[PDB]
């Protein structure tokens, strides 16, 4: 096994899995019942991903229901059935629903009612934020943040012991509902990836092939991330591609098939479980089957620019804020900071209706194209002063969400960035769509409008959402698939692709890192990035760190050592492994002895010749590299193979050692 | 560079690319114009993929137009404008169109007219098949087959010198139009991947960063395969995922973005260029926005079974036929075999209207749901004898396509398998859909129909197409994305996922290889597979082949050798590389000397000390592995890193060499 905060050596896990397969095949021939058991062991992967999908579907549904209920609880309660949210009672004047101004002051409208509603909205936002931050701080500090930056590192081979446990799962679910209902600039769509990975890790223990294997566990977590995205956006294929591109790290075509199955199971559960018949794939779905004209692809591209100019700004601003908190008085007061952020968000969001709306419903509104019956300020046409006032409201919502999400992403409560960035993009896209429609029917004499309503601002809102989401995240295929799986509009894919590449390029013009890589670099997690390349001209001899300043390379001789000597080496040295060599002078790589395996073997024996025997645990095949090998090659070895150590050699004479951590330290 | 039919060592190419980048950066600081040139060199990749997308769009459009024209030429000609196909003149009784019975016999209907149409259809099928096979045999033998099995090997690092040249491109385009119009059981959708790769390879030469680099060329070919799929199915994301899953081999997240851009460019070209306003994304598009009920997912799964039972049968039957041809008299007569196949297909396909229809229009018909105005035999409702007769016709078409595609895939003309397998699946799905609809409105009293027309056979045809396509190809995410990008129905995704997984599982029950892998094993191409694992328990010492029966390991000493000695080694030995060592006794790995580089350097010098100097070409960093390393590890090294040789060592004493070909020979 592995110690806390320690990396996973992928090759050793793969080898162990191979011996397990060999032993299972040996037991298989024993009896027909053993053949059935071997078949069950084979199905284990499908069963674990199936359970993960069912759990992710159930938990996403429960979180949606609870979050909607407690979000609407900020404006009032239902008298008929208290367990119904605003919409659930509207269709179930709206006499049933009663606001807090109605319950306390007794009069629905008037300055008194507005002030009472303002005060009660702020109070409930503070209460939900307080409960979320307090529960996270007390019972599970790992439940804060979206969590994707850390599952990226966990799928890279890193280990965070309690990160995907039961306590983190429970507290993240509860505190995510609370934070969503608190009115903070965040969403649960991102955090459902963490919740799905929690379910996957929890269910891995039910199976032996995945309980004791960290590589199989990583594969199950990749499938679980796919399921989490699938259930968050109703985007099975989009979730598969998100796990392909964002979170998971290796894909030997088996993780792809099992992510396919896990996303399928999650999507099927989400379809079967429709407690109130909400056909909307998620609360911010909007159907689309209208066509678009080539000229429209010009403004779409510009939306990408905004996204690239927002993402780029966000990664430059939020990452600068989170540093200050981490290195100032602010970082000493999690609860107080969440309280102040929630209070300010409530105070400055209650006035403007768009900011008052919970972000998912705001994105639903911005995506939905105007209908003749609708007369909301968003689709309020004579045009006249009303349209300009609506555009001004949308601009204010844009500015407010930008500023607040900058200050609100990293706070210590479950906080997503898919929905705030998506809403910023949708506000941008809707403003642009309204502007283009005004231009269209005011200047219809121009050839572009003369030859080809003519334009749907909902499509522009979709494209702006994709633009900002790709600018901040830097996701291309997963993001587009997620967007048209979310919205169902598989007729606007080319516009989405144009916006997403434009946003990614404009974002990369200011720095190639996304928000999930910048909250890995900022947190100093040990993540070896594939995008980054060892541009430095260096040799493996430099990076390897048995340096002249360092002590002698800790090693073990094959037969000279005694039990007491190796036990002393275990206790007095923190190293997790030792190169087992022929002799202190021969320095011939005989194998690699793991500190945990050595300790366990010695303890079991008490409760030395590597040729107390210790050949059972000896790693006869340690990966080696020439001392003159260029370092970039070693970086590629580590990245493609996912090794933990590579024992450099010099003309066959053991020269030292390199570890993933050594490369990561050097690359800083 | 590399010799014909020789593999690509990915690490050496990657390193060379690094030195090219370093030199470009050095030149960059020279002047601002050099900064502009460096920026152009960076854009080179986007420009090459853009050109590839434009070319693929243009060529796919031209091939569609020409193939439709020549296919309809089998039934007659248009008098108004001879350059119009049947449909182009129907909307442009249909007096304009005149069949060959009309032109020759002068009678539209009657036994004489029917016999004359029979004879002329057969004659034109023979003529087109003859021209296709003859042109391929004479001018470009590489234009035969779908070609995907070979681009799979080319993207793996193999080299086939003329395979993606200009002659292969031209002849494949022409002979693909001819084969499509010949009425053979095939399609052009698959071969457009080969055509797109041809365009990508052709355009790579316009850029130096991609002309002289085989790894960059492979990346451009991955993007080109994405573009080819995108333009073949109108499925840009589907093409990106097809290149992810089927053809291309490595994805350092840059090939993903450039495949994204190439698919975007191809899709945009296909959208812009609509010469006759055919909104159908391809001639066999069908819109879908209706819902499906959970019970319908039961028959869908069964369709997958059929697909898995067809794919499985096909890989068992066709691969058995192609072997016989390759090892019997049949393989000596390409032209005669194509003639006989075309004649039999025409003779047995003219009677049944569904087989008479070109497969793309047949799939369009099977996908299209019945409309009240339509009264075709496919949607001929009173029900009565007509429905049973239509089902019988569909069964006959199913049997005929199965049998013929088995005998018709491998013949020496451009032959795809996406469309024949898709049509078999669509016939199966339509038969099942009609059966289920009859069951639905005859037995409406059952609770499944009582609670929830009620069923669309077009959706069942979609699902059956996906079932058979995944059974034969064994593609999961790419196939589903292609299907709902092709049809636009991003509301039936879960049924497609379920049918595709069922088909893949049932197919794997009879053998895990698809059709593009069984035509690599059958052709004996040097393809190292990720799905396959070295289940054999063996050590690298066994696989390495400087065996006791083999001669001494050809090696070079660093300084002792003279120019004449190394030239003699070059001429008398066919090896492409030599381990350069310290001495014939020291056997210390100093580096690796490539035969081509050695020959070129010696020739240039005439027109030795590796410490005529030859340190410029010496590979100071040859990948090495311990002689006791398990062979599974070495296989993983080769597969993940894509090396060509791994110089095994024994306690630092050079022990031998292993090559990709050595591993492939052993795995046989
Ligand atoms: N057996 C060893 N002999 C000498 N130096 C070693 C040995 N093992 C590791 N080192 C050095 O110690 C540092 C890393 O030691 P260690 O193996 O404990 O890894 P780590 O970076 O703490 O990570 P992990 O927790 O994954 O093991 C690096 O400087 C490495 O060069
Ligand atoms: N320098 C060498 N000394 C001894 N045996 C060698 C040497 N190079 C290759 N071999 C052996 O010769 C066979 C392969 O030789 P070679 O290097 O020509 O490769 P190949 O399989 O023909 O492929 P490629 O065309 O890609 O080089 C294998 O048996 C390999 O063990």
Given a contact cutoff of 8 angstroms between Cβ atoms, the answer to whether A493 and A292 are in contact is no
Residues B194, B212: contact at Cβ < 8 Å? no
Q: Would you tell me which residues 12-31 of chain B have a C-beta closer than 8 angstroms to some C-beta of chain A?
A: 14-15, 18, 22
The residues, ordered by sequence, that sit 6+ positions from A340 with a Cβ below 8 Å of its Cβ are none
SS3 label, residue A608: coil
Report DSSP letters for A366-411, one per residue.
Answer: HHSPP-SS---GGG-----HHHHHHHHHHHHHHHHHHHHHHHHSSS
Give the Cα separation of B477 and B459 in Å (integer).
Answer: 18
Three-state DSSP class for B97?
A: strand
Place of tokens 């393989």: B331
**Is B277 in the A-facing interface, judged by CB distances under 8 Å?**
no
What is the rounded CA–CA span in Å between residue B470 and residue B448?
29
CB–CB contact A477 B240 (8 Å): yes
CA distance A158 to A150: 9
Q: How many helices (H) and strands (E) does chain B have?
A: 28, 8
Contact in structure between B646 and B637 (CB atoms under 8 Å): yes
d(CA A492, CA B446): 41
Q: Residue B644 CB: number of other CB atoms within 10 A?
A: 23
Alpha-carbon distance A536 to nearest alpha carbon in chain B (angstroms) = 10
Q: Is the minimum distance from the CB of B185 to ligand 2 under 6 angstroms?
A: no
Q: Which residues of A touch B640 (CB under 8 A)?
A: 640-641
Contacting residues for A320 by C-beta, under 8 A, at least 6 apart: none
> Is B661 marked as a binding-site residue?
yes
Decide whether any atom of ligand 2 lies within 6 Å of the B440 Cβ: no
Burial class (CB in 10 A: 0-12, 13-18, 19+), A98: middle
Cross-strand pairs, A645: A659
Nearest CA distance, A288 vs chain B (angstrom): 10
Q: What single-letter DSSP state applies at residue A630?
A: B
Binding-site members of A are 146, 418, 516, 575-577, 659-662
**Under a CB-based contact definition with an 8 Å cutoff, are residues B151 and B221 in contact?**
yes
At B662 the three-state DSSP class reads: helix
Are B354 and B397 in contact by the 8 Å Cβ rule? The answer is yes
Contacts of B528-537 with CB under 8 Å at 24 or more apart are B528/B156, B528/B635, B528/B638, B528/B639, B528/B660, B528/B663, B528/B664, B530/A252, B530/A253, B530/B639, B531/A253, B532/B667, B533/B632, B533/B635, B534/B631, B534/B632, B534/B635, B534/B667, B536/B631, B537/A22
Listed resolution, Å: 3.0
Distances from the Cα of B178 to the Cαs of B84, B235, B236, B453, in angstroms?
17, 25, 27, 41
Task: Nearest chain A residue to B629 by CA: give it.
Answer: A621
Could you say which residues from 52 to 111 on chain A have a Cβ atom under 8 Å away from some Cβ of chain B?
none
Please choose from B547, B646, B657, B665 the residue to mutate so as to test ligand 2's pocket, defined by most ligand atoms within 8 A of CB. Answer: B657
Give yes or no for A215 touching B (CB within 8 A): no
Pairing of strands B556-557, B97-99: unpaired
Residue B547 CB coordination number (10 Å): 9
Q: Report the run of H or E that residue A432 belongs to, with start and end.
A: helix A418-442
CA dihedral over B433, B405, B241, B518, signed as positive or negative? positive
Q: Rounded to whole angstroms, what are the CA distances from B384 to A441, B388, B438?
A: 55, 7, 11
State how far residue B485 is from chain A, nearest Cα, in angstroms: 7
Which DSSP symbol is given to B649?
Answer: E
Structure tokens at B593: 């000397």
Helix (H, G, I), strand (E, B) or coil at B624: strand
Atom of ligand 2 nearest to the CA of B7: 26
Is the CB–ligand 1 distance for residue A596 below 6 Å? no
Q: Summarize the annotated binding site of A for ATP as residue ranges.
A: 575-577, 659-662
Q: Is A505 exposed, middle or buried (0-12, 13-18, 19+ CB in 10 A)?
A: middle
- Please, what is the end-to-end C-alpha distance for chain A in angstroms? 28
Burial class (CB in 10 A: 0-12, 13-18, 19+), B475: buried
Q: How many CB atoms lie within 10 A of CB A75?
A: 18
A475 closest CA partner among A238, A291, A640, A638: A238
Would you say the CB of residue B553 lies under 6 angstroms from ligand 2?
A: yes
Q: Determine contact, residues A71/A184, Cβ cutoff 8 Å.
A: no
State both tokens at A169: 């799962």
Q: Identify all chain A residues contacting B624, using CB atoms and an 8 Å cutoff.
A: 624-626
Between CA B596 and CA B611 the distance in angstroms is 20
Ligand 1 contact via A592 beta carbon (within 6 Å): no
DSSP string covering B464-509: HHHHHHHHHH--SHHHHHHHHHHH--TTSHHHHHHHHHHHHHHHHT
CA distances to A30, B637, B648 from B623, rounded to whole Å, are 42, 10, 8
Closest ligand to A574 CA?
1
Q: How was this structure determined?
A: cryo-EM
* DSSP code per residue over A130-199: HHHHHHHHHH-GGG-S--HHHHHHHHTT---TTTTSHHHHHHHHHHHHHHHHTT-S--STTHHHHHHHHH
C-beta separation of B342 from B126 below 8 A: yes
Whether residue B437 contacts residue B457, with contact meaning beta carbons closer than 8 Å, is answered with yes
Q: Which residues of chain A make contact with B244, given a CB cutoff of 8 A?
A: 244
Measured between alpha carbons, how far is B79 from B102 in angstroms, rounded to an integer? 12
Compute CA distances B497 → A57, B237, B419, B477, B488, whole Å: 17, 16, 20, 8, 15
**Chain B environment of A509 (Cβ under 8 Å):** none
Strand-pair partners of B593 = B578
Q: Is the dihedral of CA A486, A487, A492, A497 positive or negative?
A: negative
What torsion do the CA atoms of A165, A171, A174, A180 make, to the nearest 10 degrees? -100
Query: Is residue B388 annotated as involved in ligand binding?
Result: no
CA-nearest of A356, A624, A310, A13 to B589 is A624
- Select from B405, B428, B462, B431 the least CA-distant residue to B284: B462
How remote is the CA of residue B518 from the centroid of ligand 2, in Å? 26
State CA B579 to chain mean position distance. Answer: 37
Between CA B567 and CA B246 the distance in angstroms is 43
Crossing angle for the helix pair A297-326 and A418-442, to the nearest 10 degrees = 150
A649 strand-pairing partners: A626, A654
Rounded (10°) angle between helices A10-28 and B631-641: 130
Which chain B residues contact residue A23 at CB under 8 A?
none
Say which residues have a Cβ less than 8 Å from residue B124's Cβ, sequence separation at least 6: B73, B74
Task: From residue A375, give the alpha-carbon distance in Å to each of A352, A362, A370, A381, A650.
Answer: 17, 16, 9, 8, 78
Q: What gap in Å lies between CA B169 and CA A270, rounded to an integer?
A: 47
The arrangement of strands across the sheet holding A653-654 comes to A624-626, A647-650, A653-654
Structure tokens, B444: 């409406």
Report CA(A659)–ligand 1 centroid distance (Å): 6
Q: How many CA atoms lie within 13 A of B105 on its CB side?
A: 19
CA angle, A370 as apex, A367 and A371 as ends, to 5°? 130
For chains A and B, what is the number of CB pairs under 8 angstroms?
A: 148
Place of tokens 């109070």: A123
- Which helix H or strand E contains B76, and what residues bound it? strand B76-78
């Amino acid at each position: 096994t592995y110690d806390d905060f320690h990396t996973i050596d992928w090759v050793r896990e793969k080898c162990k899995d191979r011996e397990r397969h060999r032993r299972i095949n040996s037991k298989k021939k024993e009896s027909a019942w053993e053949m059935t058991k071997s078949l069950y062991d084979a199905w284990s992967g499908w069963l674990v991903v199936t359970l993960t999908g069912l759990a992710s579907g159930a938990l996403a549904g429960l979180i949606d229901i609870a979050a909607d209920w407690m979000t609407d609880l900020k404006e009032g309660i239902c008298l008929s059935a208290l367990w119904y949210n605003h919409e659930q009672c509207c269709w179930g004047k709206c006499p049933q629903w009663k606001t807090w101004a109605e319950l306390i002051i007794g009069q629905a409208e008037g300055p008194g009612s507005y002030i009472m509603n303002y005060i009660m909205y702020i109070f409930w936002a503070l209460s939900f934020a307080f409960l979320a931050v307090s529960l996270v701080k007390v019972f599970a500090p790992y439940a804060c943040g979206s969590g994707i930056p850390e599952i990226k590192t966990i799928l890279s081979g890193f280990i965070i012991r309690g990160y995907l446990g039961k306590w983190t799962l429970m507290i993240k679910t509860i505190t995510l509902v609370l934070a969503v209902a608190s009115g903070l600039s965040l969403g649960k769509e991102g955090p459902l990836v963490h919740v799905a990975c929690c379910c996957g890790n929890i269910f891995s223990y039910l199976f032996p092939k995945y309980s004791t294997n960290e590589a199989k566990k990583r594969e199950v977590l990749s499938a679980a991330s796919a399921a989490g995205v699938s259930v968050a956006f109703g985007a099975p294929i989009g979730g598969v591609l998100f796990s392909l591109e964002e979170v998971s790290y290796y894909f030997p075509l088996k993780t792809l098939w099992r992510s396919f199955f896990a996303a399928l199971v999650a999507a099927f559960v989400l379809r079967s479980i429709n407690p109130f018949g909400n056909s909307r794939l998620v609360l911010f779905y909007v159907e689309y089957h209208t066509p678009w004209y080539l000229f429209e692809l010009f403004p779409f591209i510009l939306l990408g620019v905004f996204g690239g100019l927002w993402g780029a700004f966000f990664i430059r601003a939020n990452i600068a804020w989170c540093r200050r908190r981490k290195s100032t008085k602010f970082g000493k007061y999690p609860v107080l900071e969440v309280i102040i952020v929630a209070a300010i968000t409530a105070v400055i969001a209650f006035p403007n209706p768009y900011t008052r709306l919970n972000t998912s419903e705001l994105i639903k509104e911005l995506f939905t194209d105007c209908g003749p019956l609708e007369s909301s300020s968003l689709c309020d046409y004579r045009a006249g002063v009303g349209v300009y006032s609506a555009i001004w409201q949308l601009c204010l919502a844009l500015i407010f969400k930008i500023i607040m999400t900058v200050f609100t992403f990293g706070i210590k409560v479950p906080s997503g960035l898919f929905i705030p960035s998506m809403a910023i993009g949708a506000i941008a896209g809707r403003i642009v769509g309204i502007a283009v429609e005004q231009l269209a029917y005011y200047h219809h004499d121009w050839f572009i409008f003369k030859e080809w309503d003519c334009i749907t601002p909902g499509l522009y809102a979709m494209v702006g959402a994709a633009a900002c989401l790709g600018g901040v995240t830097r996701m291309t295929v997963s993001l587009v698939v997620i967007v048209f799986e979310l919205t169902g509009g598989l007729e606007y894919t080319v516009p989405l692709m144009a916006a997403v590449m434009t946003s990614k390029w404009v974002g990369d013009a200011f720095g190639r890192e996304g928000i999930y890589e910048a909250h890995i670099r900022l947190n100093g997690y040990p993540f070896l990035d594939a995008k980054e390349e060892f541009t430095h001209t260096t040799l493996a001899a430099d990076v390897m760190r048995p340096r002249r300043s360092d002590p002698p390379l800790a090693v073990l001789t094959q037969d000279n050592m005694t039990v007491d000597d190796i036990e002393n080496m275990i206790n007095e040295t923190s190293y997790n492994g030792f190169p087992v060599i022929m002799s202190k002078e021969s320095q011939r790589l005989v194998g690699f002895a793991l500190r945990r395996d050595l300790t366990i073997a010695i303890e079991s024996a008490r409760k030395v010749c590597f040729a107390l025997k210790l050949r059972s645990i000896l790693d006869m095949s340690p990966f080696t590299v020439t001392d003159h090998t260029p370092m970039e090659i070693v970086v590629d070895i580590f990245r493609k193979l996912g090794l933990r150590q590579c024992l450099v050699t010099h003309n066959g004479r053991l020269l030292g050692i390199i570890t993933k951590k050594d490369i990561l330290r050097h690359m800083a």
